């Protein structure tokens, strides 16, 4: 077990969204426990998990920068960006759907960190 992998899934994986609008972001950010304080930006990756884990190997990733990995395939993602002045709930979010490759950090063949800089 890797608690950082499980935390990765909680913070950054959502298999099957439908509408990835502002209200999607407000709900899932509350649901995954990311609202006290409001995380300023957070991105969710969609689709299957095997594709995400595959970034940790040659199959679907390349080494990137300082011990990160960058994916070969593009993913459906949604970025939730905090707006308003306050760090505390109610946390209002702007949703930005995207489709591109993702940067992760892996440990023991498992993603444990999502690089958020590429989405801000």
Author numbering: 2 to 121
Sentences from the paper on this structure:
Thus in native ANG, the T44-T80 hydrogen bond selectively weakens the interaction between T44 and N3 of cytosine. However, a significant number of van der Waals contacts surrounding residue T44 are lost in the variant structure. In addition, the absence of Cγ2 atom in the variant structure meant that most of the van der Waals hydrophobic interactions with I42 are lost as well. It is quite likely that this results in slight reduction in stability, causing the observed loss in catalytic activity (~22%).
Angiogenin (ANG), a 14-kDa basic protein is an angiogenic ribonuclease and member of the bovine pancreatic ribonuclease (RNase A) family (also known as RNase 5). The enzymatic activity of ANG is several orders of magnitude lower than that of RNase A towards conventional RNase substrates, but essential for its angiogenic effect.
